[PDB]
From Swiss-Prot, chain B:
Residues 1-305 form the Peptidase C30 domain. The gene is rep. The chain holds residues 3264 to 3568 of 7096 of the full protein. 3CL-PRO exists as monomer and homodimer. Only the homodimer shows catalytic activity. Interacts with host FBXO22; this interaction promotes the proteasomal degradation of nsp5. Signal peptide: none annotated. This is 3C-like proteinase nsp5. Changing residue 145 to A: Complete loss of 3C-like proteinase nsp5 cleavage.
Length: 306, 305
């Protein structure tokens, strides 16, 4: 019993964190096999940040301009290349702590653990979701660039995010490990803003199923809804549209609890209308949207309480 | 910017988790140096749990009855002893991954990271607080016993909790690493209940300072209060008393934000008496009490390990 915002154990990623320095700028790098991945803006001065020409800035650098430190050991850079917004520094030592890994690009609503780092050293681990507006509501200070997001389903680390920047609202933007930004963001100091964010409906439904599995049913009602009527209501509270894919994905939780997806949708519609009336669901007075259907099945028991 | 419920990096603890099997029961063990620590109830059948005599159950076991697996490697148990509610299995191999560590007993209100494990395999890491009623609101399934709680101070892991049981309300009970339970709990299948819990006042104040540091100020007001008047209001709302030690501990956050501790207490008093009025603080509609003043400073300063 219990339901917590749970991150993956971070050890497999901690053994990959290194410090990358180029001139006066120091940030984090991810050392996997003989390559260190880091944000390409490590080669920029603060003045270069408005309209940097990364190809032009990079051509002026040699391997010895990149200082990579792993623990108290300086790695030797033997090659460098840029792939989209990520810099790949070939080093002369394969990381002996390289876990089984993959690079995965995620979709909005997906969750992942972030290992926040500074100067190549891990500071903490927390759980995030890729918001519908492609930002993440992280906790990052200056020096956190290059910190990564990941999942570890089995013993394989799927790296899905590398931190690049903080937007004016205090939310964060980054790339996949191939250097492609999530969202319409660029690694430039030009005026950029997070679009209006919305609630991840499928995740709220998953979390309501988590509450039912853990023994709470106060919020259920005798009603059902069509998918279209649910979407017309939910959009009025800035909730993401629920697709038939989302309904299918919630099938297993629906079968385990005995509550049809559209019946749980009717419960959510009522919660949006009524609020919680002094009650909580899984220790929260707000509807939680940073647990996916996959997270709920992984965290919760396979036996519903009642 | 941003403020998240953040756990310590778990790698140093992951390298210590092992699987301990005794008969039909499998749970987690903590392998440090040449000793594996685990809940003593690993030696019990369901019948034994009703009223166990752990000394009597243990005397019937030999070293080979304990199967300890560190990954895909079977460790050989060369001795066994009980310390309070923890079983200590001496093994022939010192854990090469043993970090610098200490065993510390924490006080209610203190937070720690839990590395939830099943079959000696870490599954998740989360941050929680030792409640004033000595339970933890964890997330644990069957097989999670022996999962540990810890903090990191510099390069040293301070182990403070070992998971033993789940109470009927779904909250959790465990011991320090010396096997002393937190709270009035016993490792036996007998009627036990979590006592009425209270809110960790100093932690709510720390989180309000975190909200201010993050640009959330709507709850600030021109008012101050005395410590005694604040504690009268705290008692009324099932909040823990705020001591002068708590006020001193919040000094640095008070100096950084310009909001004196008693000035923040008057914000907290108004929030308790009136609610949030449809507003949120750091994305929460409830007052969060599972961040200590140290956690707030650490997260807002970027301390690494
Ligand atoms: O955003 C940047 C630097 C940057 C600026 C830019 F215009 C484009 C970039 F790709 C990167 N750094 C930070 C990242 N995360 C959190 C932070 C918090 C405070 C101060 C800086 C933080
Ligand atoms: O509570 C126990 C076993 C136990 C029973 C007892 F009566 C006394 C004990 F010291 C230990 N194990 C569990 C721990 N955490 C979570 C669980 C969730 C579901 C089922 C069991 C869970």
């Amino acid at each position: 019993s219990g339901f917590r915002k749970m991150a993956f154990p971070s050890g497999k990623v901690e053994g990959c964190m290194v410090q990358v320095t180029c001139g006066t700028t120091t940030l984090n790098g991810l050392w996997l096999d003989d390559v260190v991945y880091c944000p390409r803006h490590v080669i920029c001065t603060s003045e270069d940040m408005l309209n940097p020409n990364y190809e032009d800035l990079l051509i002026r650098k040699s391997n010895h301009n990149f200082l990579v430190q792993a623990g108290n050991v300086q790695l030797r850079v033997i090659g460098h290349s840029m792939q989209n917004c990520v810099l790949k520094l070939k080093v002369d030592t394969a990381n002996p702590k390289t876990p089984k890994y993959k690079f995965v690009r995620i979709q909005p609503g997906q969750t992942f653990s972030v290992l926040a780092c500074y100067n190549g050293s891990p500071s903490g681990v927390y759980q995030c979701a890729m918001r519908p507006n492609f930002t993440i509501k992280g906790s990052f200070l200056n020096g956190s660039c290059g910190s990564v997001g990941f999942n570890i389903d089995y013993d394989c680390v799927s790296f899905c995010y590398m931190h690049h920047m903080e937007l004016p609202t205090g939310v964060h933007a980054g790339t996949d490990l191939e250097g492609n930004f999530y969202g319409p963001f660029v690694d430039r100091q030009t005026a950029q803003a997070a679009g209006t964010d919305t609630t991840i409906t499928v995740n709220v439904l998953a979390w309501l199923y988590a509450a039912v599995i853990n023994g709470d049913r106060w919020f259920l009602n005798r009603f059902t809804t069509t998918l279209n009527d649910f979407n017309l209501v939910a959009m009025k509270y800035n909730y993401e549209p629920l697709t038939q894919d989302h309904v299918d994905i919630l099938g297993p939780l629906s079968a385990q609890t005995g509550i049809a997806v559209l019946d749980m949708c009717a419960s959510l519609k009522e919660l949006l209308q009524n609020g919680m009336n002094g009650r909580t669901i899984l220790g929260s007075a707000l509807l939680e949207d940073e647990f996916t259907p996959f997270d709920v099945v992984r965290q919760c028991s396979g036996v519903t309480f009642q």
